[PDB]
Design an enzyme around this catalytic site. Structure first.
Site, PDB file in Angstrom:
ATOM      1  N   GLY B  29       0.831  -1.185   0.000  1.00 16.18           N
ATOM      2  CA  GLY B  29       0.000   0.000   0.000  1.00 16.18           C
ATOM      3  C   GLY B  29       0.866   1.235   0.000  1.00 16.18           C
ATOM      4  N   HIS B  47      10.428  -3.307   0.546  1.00 19.55           N
ATOM      5  CA  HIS B  47      10.197  -2.185  -0.392  1.00 19.55           C
ATOM      6  C   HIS B  47      10.195  -0.873   0.393  1.00 19.55           C
ATOM      7  CE1 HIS B  47       7.520   0.113  -3.320  1.00 19.55           C
ATOM      8  NE2 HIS B  47       8.709  -0.029  -3.894  1.00 19.55           N
ATOM      9  N   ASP B  89      11.717  -0.361  -6.527  1.00 17.29           N
ATOM     10  CA  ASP B  89      10.493  -0.821  -7.173  1.00 17.29           C
ATOM     11  C   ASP B  89      10.721  -2.128  -7.920  1.00 17.29           C
ATOM     12  OD1 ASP B  89       9.437   1.568  -6.213  1.00 17.29           O
ATOM     13  OD2 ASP B  89       9.773   2.622  -8.110  1.00 17.29           O
TER      14      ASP B  89
END
Ligand SMILES: C/C=C1/C[N@@+]2(C)[C@H]3C[C@@H]1[C@@](CO)(C(=O)OC)[C@@H]2Cc1c3n(C)c2c(OC)cccc12
Lengths: 119, 121
Positions: B29, B47, B89
Site C-alpha cells: 500500500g 520495499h 520498485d
C-alpha cells in the site's frame, strides 16, 4: 559523528570503513558528490544527499546514540536532526553491505568526476 | 512512482497491482509499514525499507524510465536517486512474483486493524 558512521559500516559489512570507503569512487570520502561509478558509490552519493537536508547539527562531529538489536541498526530518538543524521548513516551502512558484491578495488582511491546532479 | 512501480508489478506477476497489492497485509500500500503478515508482505516491507534509505533524494522527482528487455526490468536512469528508486520498485516486483504461490486473498483487504508495529528496518 564518524565514529558512529564507521561503527555502522563495520557492523553492517564487517569491513574496515576507512580502508574500504574512506576514499572510494567519487562520493565515499571528502570533496562532496560526483558522478557515481557503481552501486557502492551510489550509496555514498545518497548519503551526502541525505546530509544536505540536515539542519541543526553537524554530521561529522555530533555524536548520537544507536543500538544493535536483531542484527539491525536501531537509531536512538536523541534529537530530530540527530535522528535524521543517524538514519543517513544507517541507510548508507545498509546500502554498502547490500552492494558489497559489486565492490571493486580499482575505485578504492579517488576532481576527475563530473559535477553531481541535484539531489 | 506508483505508475512505474505498478507497471513493474503487472509485468512480473501478471496481476492488477492495485487490486492485489494496493492494501495487502500490513505493508503493501501507499501508506505505511507493519508486522509482515506473510512472505508477500515482506516484499512490501523490504520495499518500504528500501525507500527509507533514499532520504535526501528529492521527494518530488519519482518519475523514471525503466526498460522491459527480455522480460527483465532494467533500471538505466542516470540519476542515482532515480536508479536506486527504480531498484527498490524492481526488487518488490520480483519478490511479489516469486511469492505468488503463497499469495492469500484474505490479506488483500484488511477490514479490521490487525497490524502489529513494524520492527526497525
Ligand atoms: C524518490 C521519490 C519518492 C517519492 N515518494 C512519494 C515515492 C518514492 C520516493 C519516496 C520514498 O520514500 C521518497 O520520498 O524518497 C526520497 C516518496 C514516498 C513514497 C513513494 N512511494 C512510491 C511510496 C509508496 O508506494 C508504495 C508507499 C509509501 C511511500 C511512498
Amino acid at each position: 559523528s564518524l565514529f558512529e558512521l564507521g561503527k555502522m559500516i563495520l557492523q553492517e559489512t564487517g569491513k574496515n570503513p576507512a580502508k574500504s570507503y574512506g576514499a572510494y569512487g567519487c562520493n565515499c570520502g571528502v570533496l562532496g558528490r560526483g558522478k557515481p561509478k557503481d552501486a557502492t558509490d551510489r550509496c555514498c552519493y545518497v548519503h551526502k544527499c541525505c546530509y544536505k537536508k540536515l539542519t541543526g547539527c553537524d554530521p561529522k562531529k555530533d555524536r548520537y546514540s544507536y543500538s544493535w538489536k536483531d542484527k539491525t541498526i536501531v537509531c536512538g530518538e536523541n534529537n530530530p536532526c540527530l535522528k535524521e543524521l543517524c538514519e543517513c548513516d544507517k541507510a548508507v551502512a545498509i546500502c554498502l553491505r547490500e552492494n558489497l558484491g559489486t565492490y571493486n578495488k580499482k575505485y578504492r582511491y579517488h576532481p576527475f568526476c563530473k559535477k553531481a546532479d541535484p539531489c
